[PDB]
Amino acid sequence: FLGLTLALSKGRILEETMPLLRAAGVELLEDPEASRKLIFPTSNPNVRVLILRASDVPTYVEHGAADFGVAGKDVLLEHGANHVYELLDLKIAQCKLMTAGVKDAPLPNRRLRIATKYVNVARAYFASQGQQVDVIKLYGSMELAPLVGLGDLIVDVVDTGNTLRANGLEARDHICDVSSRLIVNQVSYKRKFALLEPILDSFKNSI
Amino acid sequence: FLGLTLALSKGRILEETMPLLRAAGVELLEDPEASRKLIFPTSNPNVRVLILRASDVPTYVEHGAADFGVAGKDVLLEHGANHVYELLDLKIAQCKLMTAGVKDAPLPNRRLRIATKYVNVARAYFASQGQQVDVIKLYGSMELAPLVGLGDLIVDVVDTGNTLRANGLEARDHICDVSSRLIVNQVSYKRKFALLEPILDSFKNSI
Amino acid sequence: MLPDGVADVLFEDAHKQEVLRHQLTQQLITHGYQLVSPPMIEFTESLLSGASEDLKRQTFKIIDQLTGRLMGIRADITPQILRIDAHHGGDGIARYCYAGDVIHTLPSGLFGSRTPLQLGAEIFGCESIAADIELIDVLFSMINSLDMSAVLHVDLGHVTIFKRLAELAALSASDTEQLMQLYANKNLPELKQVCQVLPMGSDFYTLARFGHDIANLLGRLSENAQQDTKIVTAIDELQRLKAHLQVQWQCAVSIDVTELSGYHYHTGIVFNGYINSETQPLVRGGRFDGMPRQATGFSMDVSRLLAHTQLDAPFIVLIDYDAFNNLDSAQRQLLLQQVASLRQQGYRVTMPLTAEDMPVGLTHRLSLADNQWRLHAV
Amino acid sequence: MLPDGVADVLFEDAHKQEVLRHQLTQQLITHGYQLVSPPMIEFTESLLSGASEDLKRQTFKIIDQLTGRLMGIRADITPQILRIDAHHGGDGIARYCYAGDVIHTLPSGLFGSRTPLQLGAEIFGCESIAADIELIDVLFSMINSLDMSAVLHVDLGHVTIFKRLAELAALSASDTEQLMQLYANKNLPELKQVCQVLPMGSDFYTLARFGHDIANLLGRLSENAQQDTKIVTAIDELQRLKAHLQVQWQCAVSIDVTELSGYHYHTGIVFNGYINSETQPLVRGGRFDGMPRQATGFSMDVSRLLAHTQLDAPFIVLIDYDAFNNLDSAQRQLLLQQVASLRQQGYRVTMPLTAEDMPVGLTHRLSLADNQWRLHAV
Amino acid sequence: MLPDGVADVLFEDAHKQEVLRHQLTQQLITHGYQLVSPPMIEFTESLLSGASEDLKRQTFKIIDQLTGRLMGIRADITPQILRIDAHHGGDGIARYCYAGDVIHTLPSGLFGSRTPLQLGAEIFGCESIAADIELIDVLFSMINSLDMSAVLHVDLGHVTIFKRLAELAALSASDTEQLMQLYANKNLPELKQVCQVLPMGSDFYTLARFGHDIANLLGRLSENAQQDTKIVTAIDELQRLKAHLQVQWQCAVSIDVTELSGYHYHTGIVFNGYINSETQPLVRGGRFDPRQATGFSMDVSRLLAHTQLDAPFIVLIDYDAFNNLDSAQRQLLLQQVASLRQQGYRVTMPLTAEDMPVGLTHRLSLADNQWRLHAV
Ligand SMILES: N=c1c2ncn([C@@H]3O[C@H](COP(=O)(O)OP(=O)(O)OP(=O)(O)O)[C@@H](O)[C@H]3O)c2ncn1[C@@H]1O[C@H](COP(=O)(O)O)[C@@H](O)[C@H]1O
Ligand SMILES: N=c1c2ncn([C@@H]3O[C@H](COP(=O)(O)OP(=O)(O)OP(=O)(O)O)[C@@H](O)[C@H]3O)c2ncn1[C@@H]1O[C@H](COP(=O)(O)O)[C@@H](O)[C@H]1O
Ligand SMILES: [Cl-]
Ligand SMILES: [Cl-]
Ligand SMILES: [Cl-]
Ligand SMILES: [Cl-]
Ligand SMILES: [Mg+2]
Ligand SMILES: [Mg+2]
């Protein structure tokens, strides 16, 4: 395959990306949920699409299995976007990374135990606040961890705050703002710029 | 060996070449006759010398076994100097290529039989005179051939004419003037010009 | 024993030659050149129309038993391209390519081939230096696709500079022929001598002495030569192609305006591409007469690329004779489906006739282990 | 199982590595560079004197049991060259080369090596662009001796242009750090936004947008920038090296004045040599502080050349065990004289201990046939 | 200031070191030894598998930040050769050589180096004395190629003699450790004392007192020791190698059967090559560890004081004359310079009129359109 391979994040991000694509040359022929297909052709014959876990997008781009991709800034910070170019802030799928604990519960007199998917971000954030933390790695349902004692605080993406409030939790500290970003493989940027520039300019025009 | 290899003709030519060399950087440490050595070092460490049959010099140069060489023009015309550069007329070892027959003997009423070392030159010369000839190849003692009937005429190098007159022969036609020439391998001329130019200029100055 | 300059091309070399012929031809087609495949034999009337004496001597003759007329085995495809362009090409721009065997009566270089596989490209109907520039881009795109470690050096010439000087100086034929011999042999001293008594002699000396420095060549020539429109343009074309080669293609370029091989047929710019330190050019090209119809083109012997190119090592597979014959019909059809897929990918798979049937250069066996056919290296 | 980024180099690759290390070192010596071979370990006081934070994190620490002081395993030889130059180099021009193992705590690139064989060259005491030009000539003489089909692409930068703009514009540290991030990520739109409110903002936009076109870069900058002596000279140095690389060495050159890796240690021109489409540079070089003492240099991982270079296939010879033991003493001495001569020529000859003793990769047997020892291919 | 036992190798010494490393390696390759180049670092699990306590203390430890596991900087390449032979070597005879830097935490002898350039050769899969004989012939062929005036003296030992006596006498570990200390120090009086109360004590005294006289050593031992097959063969191997060294190589040999350094890893014959009267062996070798192995190694850096290269040719091009040249003249000069460099001349293109290489022997100067070399 000589065209561009585009790595898209599966869930929340995919919904707000589709309008940006259609404004460019690109739109999917099938639908991701209905079809059990991994590689998707588009309206543009020079663009191919991969529908991936949000966590896997940076990996595919960095190793050049995809030429470019749309990925959450929370995922890029946690992954370490060392070997990719972060070309555009798409300003979609906006949210915040925050700390959250139980409502009105006091901080214990010890090293805080942090339950999170975002272990590098947690460690980094609490290091910047001069706090030493014991980090516990989890993959899903961060809300649960403080309720059964698994950690004192969590770190997770928060938009409205309803999931936290519905489980008796409150937000504590703002870590940073998050949005989906356009990432491009270092080598693809040099070798396939002719294919990329018109798509990059249409995404730029779409905001 | 990274320096230049110089192909010299063994006999009559070698005597008149030695002065041209000494004026350049080059002079032999031993002597060619006394030593049974094929490859001779010189005063210049970048120049090597090969003492060869006069007939073999163009072959060694053309195949690049020698970078350059001194060779008779009679040998070059007979050989066909197609793949070498004839850079300089050295004006040494001068003589003529001629036809010769028996003194006062009549030409027979038939295709002339020519006995010679110089078969291509003979054929070419007699072709330019619009004459058809039967050529007989010999390697030595051309003078003898007409005396025992082997051919009607010979073709050979003549200087004073004494060898012809001492065997009862006379010169008939002048074919061309001959002198030793400086020949250089096509590839050596490009790759080793830096080594060649000072030697070429000193030979040029020596006449 | 084959004749001198005639060799079999066998086995992996034959496969490599077939890959090169095919891939280079396809590249030429994608650059917009129309492939033509003229015959090996023609009447001499067409094959040697306007030929040089060298081309005539290089061409084997044979008699047509149907008409009693003379034919030749082609030594060069270019004159067949002219015939084709005259019938099919029209007045506008036409592009052609080709790859075919040609036969020569004598080799060109020491131990050279008499049966080259001649591949080439030609543009008719464009006077501009842009057509020569396009040919360079096609050539170098082809050379770079070969992934060679061998370095191509390009020597540029332009026969018009000398031809115009010879006109303006009003040289006789013997004077022209002497200078060409002296140029051919780089005899600078004797050239210096002859030029002191010839008209515009210092110009003919300047070509040989300073022609390599093309940026300054016009300013070293005499006022009559600098006022000649054809000399100024020829020098300009040399500078344009030199620059294009260095900048676009990272190519070492030398200039030699005393390069007058093919004085007969070249009408302008000439190109000689050398591989490492090999004496005979790998690529020969330049302007010629397409007839008033402009033509430019190059050709090369594909067989001379074989020593400088490499393919990936082949996968040579043998199916186990015994295991295959133990199979039921359904098992055999599954195995053959697998074999068809391997062959589609370029694996060379031998279905054995006997228990001893072994292909040359065996790398792998396709063997049955616990109801599974896998490839195992030998 | 070895640690990530740590691999054996075995057999023909080991021989190739040894040949490369030796031949490249010898070439450097013939260009007038003095070979130095500093130790793997030093006190951190010398090894990390003026080191960046990346170099400190890249350096393994160990304790000296004789003094209780901290040492490091070197991650970079260049600081050892500075130590050596300070003691031995004097005030004039000094040239050094080296080739030694270095250890890194983390790999640089994806699946990169943590144990490169670091080879390099450095010139101290010359401010002129001529010293950088000489380093390029040495590098390219070395690269061309390797006879690779792989193509080296060179990217030039110059950190002074950005550093001087940052001074003249009087940028804060956070503004400097933001532009460096935007440059690193080629975020042109957001760079355009930030530059509309910064002082001399259009200059910082111009570097990213038009810095590739180095011929015209000075004329796109603001009057304050065009009057700065250090910007004019830095741009001039870029044009000089670009030209030298294209013309002398047939090298494709790109320019990137926003290439600000090693902002800490580079003081001027920077050079990054890429091999085919591999992400991490094969060669890294440029101006640095030799201390006021000028320094310029490059280095590379010799082990990354192994995949792109080839040696001639080895001759691996076995003497026949039975035939050798049948010999009288005089016959054995003649055979051993013959074997010594073969080994002098680089043949790998095994004297067998037993009738089964067989070297890996056997190409030839040295066999007795009618009172004559000849080599026969297997 | 470098740490104790740590030195730069600079300039002509560095060039000499590189020439020695390369020429010795190439010689080994031509004798059929396969070059291997293992890494400086490994996990300790592989690097110190079955290591002695001395080797463990000699090995620097560092932590792998990708796994949290311990690594070591190698103090010895031989264990890496074993790892390699186990994966690639098969059951037959396999030959390996190597040359690489190793790091030691403490110097081995008084004023020793902590960063030797370790070069060596090893044969696996041959039980015969012929493999040891081959290694001796390779070593001495290498030593003789160096054209040293320094003489190598060889001390032979054999750890099996003491190990078999210790078995037959049924010695405890503390008794074994005491005798090894007394042997290490040749404390003959105190050895005499301790041996009066040990079982087969007079045999352990005889090793130290008379082990040098290997021709008569078997006849000085007790009847139980003389009936032991392994003692008789070990003594026989010593006599065979001694003779081979004297006759084939004109080599002075001493015998010491109480040489028990590396008691842990040596399984038989041991070889220590001394250079003039220097305390630490230049060459260490012997049998080691079911797969047979024998080998030697040396510190290439210790050869530097005992070897000489031909004086280098160091050339400077005239600055002024070079800058007077036109472009075509410069390209001809550079072609000439490339050819000189191909021949091993060290040619400096000057950057300035003051640019002078260290140890200048020649100038390349222009006289009448000719660049010639003149001695300074
Ligand atoms: N609100 C978001 C949200 N907003 C934006 N994004 C982006 O979407 C990416 C994750 O996409 P997914 O929807 O696939 O991930 P997920 O829903 O966390 O987990 P899955 O079960 O889908 O695997 C992140 O990397 C963000 O960049 C969000 N990802 C997850 N959420 C969650 O959605 C819920 C809504 O939160 P409130 O609005 O605060 O109640 C909470 O559970 C939030 O943690
Ligand atoms: N006179 C010459 C003569 N003059 C110049 N040369 C050159 O010397 C080259 C041959 O060199 P050699 O002396 O080795 O050859 P050779 O003497 O013919 O034969 P050899 O027995 O030496 O092999 C020729 O290629 C010429 O370029 C001559 N070569 C040969 N001769 C012979 O010398 C004799 C003297 O001739 P007169 O002076 O006319 O009597 C006659 O036999 C001539 O043929
Ligand atoms: Cl809240
Ligand atoms: Cl006469
Ligand atoms: Cl052809
Ligand atoms: Cl490196
Ligand atoms: Mg043609
Ligand atoms: Mg460095």
In angstroms, the CA E298 to CA E116 distance is 9
Please identify which residue in the block is written with the tokens 């694509």.
A21
* Pairwise CB contact (< 8 Å): B195 & E333: no
Q: In chain D, what residues touch C149 (CB-CB under 8 Å)?
A: 147-149
Method: X-ray
Query: E213: Cβ–Cβ under 8 A, 6 or more apart, which residues?
Result: E255
In the sheet that holds E253-255, the strands lie side by side as D9-10, E34-37, E94-101, E117-124, E293-299, E283-288, E266-275, E152-158, E253-255
Q: Say how many C-beta atoms besides its own lie within 10 A of residue D280's C-beta.
A: 18
Residue at a domain's end among E311, E331, E354: E311
Which 3 state secondary structure label does DSSP give B141? coil
Q: Which residue type is seen at D194? A: V
Q: C315: closest CA among C263, C363, C269, C360?
A: C363
Residue extents of the structural domains in chain A = 1-94+177-207, 95-176
Q: A158: closest CA among A144, A180, A177?
A: A177
Give C238→chain E minimum CA distance, Å.
19
Region of A130 please: left (phi>0), alpha (psi -120 to 50) or beta: left
Burial of C377 (0-12, 13-18, 19+ CB in 10 A): exposed
Q: How many domains does chain C have?
A: 2
Q: Are residues C66 and C161 in the same domain?
A: yes
Locate the chain B residue with the closest alpha carbon to C190.
B88
Structure-block tokens of residue A42: 């588009």
Q: Are residues E298 and E206 in the same domain?
A: yes
Instruction: List D residues 16-75 in contact with E (Cβ-Cβ < 8 A).
Output: 17-18, 22, 25-27, 29-32, 34-43, 46, 60-62, 64-67, 69, 71, 73
Residue B81 Cα to ligand 6 midpoint, Å, equals 54
Q: E283: closest CA among E102, E80, E140?
A: E140
For D343, the domain range is 314-378
Measured between CB atoms, does C248 come within 8 Å of chain D? no
The ligand 2 atom nearest the CA atom of B180: 27
Q: Which of A15, A157, A181 to probe ligand 1 with, by most ligand atoms within 8 A of CB?
A: A157
Taking CA B120 as the corner, what is the angle to CA B116 and CA B126, rounded to the nearest 5 degrees? Answer: 80
**β-strands A180-185, A68-72 pairing:** antiparallel
Measured between CB atoms, does B186 come within 8 Å of chain C? yes
**β-strands C316-319, C364-369 pairing:** parallel
In angstroms, the CA E320 to CA C131 distance is 46
Q: Domain for residue C5, yes or no?
A: no
Q: Which ligand is nearest to the CA of A58?
A: 1
Contact D149, D131 (CB under 8 A): no
Residue D24 Cα to ligand 6 midpoint, Å, equals 15
Query: E358: Cβ–Cβ under 8 A, 6 or more apart, which residues?
Result: D34, E11, E314
Q: Domain for residue D2, yes or no?
A: no
Query: What's the distance, CA D327 to chain centroid?
Result: 53
In angstroms, the CA D63 to CA D69 distance is 6
Query: Is the minimum distance from the CB of A160 to ligand 1 under 6 angstroms?
Result: yes
- Rounded to the nearest 10 degrees, the angle between the axes of helix E12-30 and helix D12-30 is 150
Q: Domain for residue C4, yes or no?
A: no
Measured between CB atoms, does E151 come within 8 Å of chain D? no
> At residue E373, what are phi and psi to the nearest 5 degrees?
-90, 130
Measured between CB atoms, does B195 come within 8 Å of chain E? yes
Q: What is the 3-state secondary structure (H, E, C) of chain D?
A: CCCCCCCCEECHHHHHHHHHHHHHHHHHHHCCCEEEECCCEEEHHHHCCCCCHHHHHHCCEEECCCCCCEEEECCCCHHHHHHHHHHHCCCCCEEEEEEEECCCCCCCCCCCCCCCEEEEEEEECCCCHHHHHHHHHHHHHHHHHCCCCCCEEEEEEEHHHHHHHHHHCCCCHHHHHHHHHHHHCCCHHHHHHHHCCCCCHHHHHHHHHHCCCHHHHHHHCCHHHHCCHHHHHHHHHHHHHHHHHHHHHCCCEEECCCCCCCCCCEEEEEEEEEECCCCCCCEEEEEEECCCCEEEEEEEEHHHHHHHCCCCCCCEEEECHHHHHCCCHHHHHHHHHHHHHHHHCCCEEECCCCCCCCCCCCCEEEEEECCEEEEEEC
Query: B158: Cβ–Cβ under 8 A, 6 or more apart, which residues?
Result: B95, B96, B97, B98, B100, B164, B171
Query: Which of D12, D20, D27, D41 would best serve as a mutation to test chain E binding (most E beta carbons within 10 A)?
Result: D41
In angstroms, the CA D308 to CA D146 distance is 9
Q: Domain for residue E131, yes or no?
A: yes
Q: Domain for residue E4, yes or no?
A: no
Query: What's the distance, CA C245 to chain centroid?
Result: 18
In angstroms, the CA E12 to CA E115 distance is 19
Query: What's the distance, CA C65 to chain centroid?
Result: 33
Query: A65: Cβ–Cβ under 8 A, 6 or more apart, which residues?
Result: A5, A7
Q: Domain for residue D357, yes or no?
A: yes
Q: Are residues D298 and D330 in the same domain?
A: no
Q: The dihedral of CA E302, E306, E310, E312: what is its sign?
A: positive
Q: Are residues D71 and D114 in the same domain?
A: yes
Q: Are residues E254 and E370 in the same domain?
A: no
In angstroms, the CA D322 to CA D352 distance is 10
Contact E215, E238 (CB under 8 A): no
* Pairwise CB contact (< 8 Å): C252 & D250: yes
Residue at a domain's end among C293, C313, C333: C313
Q: Are residues D146 and D247 in the same domain?
A: yes
Query: What's the distance, CA B53 to chain centroid?
Result: 9
* Pairwise CB contact (< 8 Å): C110 & B189: no
Query: Is the minimum distance from the CB of A83 to ligand 1 under 6 angstroms?
Result: no
**CB-nearest partner of D10 from E36, E95, E342:** E36
Please identify which residue in the block is written with the tokens 């020593």.
C307
Give C185→chain B minimum CA distance, Å.
5
**β-strands E117-124, E94-101 pairing:** antiparallel
Q: Where are the alpha helices (DSSP H) in chain B?
A: 12-23, 57-62, 73-79, 119-128, 144-147, 162-166, 186-191, 193-205
Chains B and D touching, counted as 3 or more CB pairs less than 8 Å apart: no
Residue at a domain's end among C313, C341, C370: C313
Structure-block tokens of residue C240: 């344009």
Contact A36, A18 (CB under 8 A): no
**CB-nearest partner of D39 from E8, E342, E355:** E8
Q: What are the beta bridge partners of residue E307?
A: none
Measured between CB atoms, does B204 come within 8 Å of chain C? yes
* CA distance from start to end of chain E: 36
In angstroms, the CA D143 to CA D249 distance is 11
**CB-nearest partner of E84 from D10, D35, D37:** D10
Contact E75, E58 (CB under 8 A): yes
Residue closest by Cα to atom 44 of ligand 1:
A157
Q: Are residues D298 and D335 in the same domain?
A: no
Q: E151: closest CA among E248, E278, E299?
A: E278
Q: Say how many C-beta atoms besides its own lie within 10 A of residue D269's C-beta.
A: 21
Burial of C116 (0-12, 13-18, 19+ CB in 10 A): buried
Structure-block tokens of residue C298: 């190059």
Superfamily of domain A95-176: Periplasmic binding protein-like II (3.40.190.10)
What is the architecture of the domain spanning B1-94+177-207? 3-Layer(aba) Sandwich (3.40)
Q: A62: closest CA among A187, A188, A182, A185?
A: A185
**CB-nearest partner of D348 from E32, E62, E65:** E32
Query: What's the distance, CA E83 to chain centroid?
Result: 20
Query: Is the minimum distance from the CB of A163 to ligand 1 under 6 angstroms?
Result: yes
Contact A133, A114 (CB under 8 A): yes
Locate the chain D residue with the closest alpha carbon to A63.
D110
Q: Which ligand is nearest to the CA of C51?
A: 7
Query: D144: Cβ–Cβ under 8 A, 6 or more apart, which residues?
Result: none
Q: Are residues C233 and C197 in the same domain?
A: yes
In angstroms, the CA A114 to CA A146 distance is 9
Structure-block tokens of residue A130: 């001069």
Cα separation values, C35 from B85, C94, C95, C359, Å: 40, 12, 9, 36
> At residue E278, what are phi and psi to the nearest 5 degrees?
-80, 140
Q: Domain for residue D1, yes or no?
A: no
Q: What is the resolution of this structure in A?
A: 2.3
Q: Are residues E56 and E118 in the same domain?
A: yes
Torsion of CA A183, A186, A190, A191, to 10 degrees: -90
Query: C370: Cβ–Cβ under 8 A, 6 or more apart, which residues?
Result: none
> At residue B49, what are phi and psi to the nearest 5 degrees?
-125, 140
Which 3 state secondary structure label does DSSP give E14? helix
Q: Domain for residue E2, yes or no?
A: no
Which run of H or of E encompasses B70? strand B68-72
Contact E337, D138 (CB under 8 A): no
Contact B75, B86 (CB under 8 A): no
Q: Are residues C362 and C232 in the same domain?
A: no
Please identify which residue in the block is written with the tokens 């503390």.
E174
Q: What are the beta bridge partners of residue B9?
A: B52
Q: What are the beta bridge partners of residue E347?
A: E315
Q: In chain C, what residues touch D148 (CB-CB under 8 Å)?
A: 149
Q: Are residues D268 and D333 in the same domain?
A: no
Give C137→chain D minimum CA distance, Å.
16
Q: D372: closest CA among D315, D316, D327?
A: D327
> Which residues does a 6 A CB cutoff place in the pocket of ligand 2?
B 10-13, 54, 72, 74-75, 93, 95, 156-163, 178
Contact E84, E39 (CB under 8 A): no
Measured between CB atoms, does B198 come within 8 Å of chain E? yes
Q: A179: closest CA among A62, A76, A102, A82?
A: A76
Q: Are residues D275 and D363 in the same domain?
A: no
> At residue E347, what are phi and psi to the nearest 5 degrees?
-115, 120
Contact C7, C70 (CB under 8 A): no
**CB-nearest partner of D279 from A88, A187, A204:** A187
Query: What's the distance, CA C77 to chain centroid?
Result: 11
Query: Is the minimum distance from the CB of A90 to ligand 1 under 6 angstroms?
Result: no
Give C87→chain E minimum CA distance, Å.
49
List all chains that touch chain A, counting a touch as 3 or more CB pairs closer than 8 Å. Answer: D
Q: The dihedral of CA B162, B163, B166, B170: what is its sign?
A: negative
Which run of H or of E encompasses C204? helix C201-210
Contact C69, C62 (CB under 8 A): no
Q: Say how many C-beta atoms besides its own lie within 10 A of residue C360's C-beta.
A: 8
Domain B1-94+177-207 and domain B95-176 have a common topology: yes
Query: B43: Cβ–Cβ under 8 A, 6 or more apart, which residues?
Result: B25, B26, B27, B29
In angstroms, the CA E324 to CA E321 distance is 5
**β-strands E362-367, E370-375 pairing:** antiparallel
